[PDB]
Amino acid sequence: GFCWGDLCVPYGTCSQLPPWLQDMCAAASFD
């Protein structure tokens, strides 16, 4: 879960994102 201040990328944004952004969203899910 990558956090930019208070903006943490939701773990469940992956299907709303396209493949290349899902790659990071994978680490968003696990971090």
- In angstroms, the CA 25 to CA 18 distance is 10
- What's phi and psi for 7, nearest 5 deg? -90, 95
> 5-27 as b/e, with b when 16 or more CB fall inside 10 Å?
eeeebeeeebeeeeeeeeeebee
Please tell me the distance from the alpha carbon of residue 17 to that of residue 24, in angstroms, as a whole number.
10
Number of structural domains (the chain) is: 1
The experimental technique used to determine this model is NMR
Cα distances from 4 to residues 14, 30, in angstroms, run: 18, 16
For residue 4, the cross-strand partners are 7
Domain that holds residue 2: 1-31
The strand ranges marked E within the chain are: 3-4, 7-8
Long-range pairs, 22-30, Cβ under 8 A, ≥24: 27/2, 28/1, 28/2, 29/1
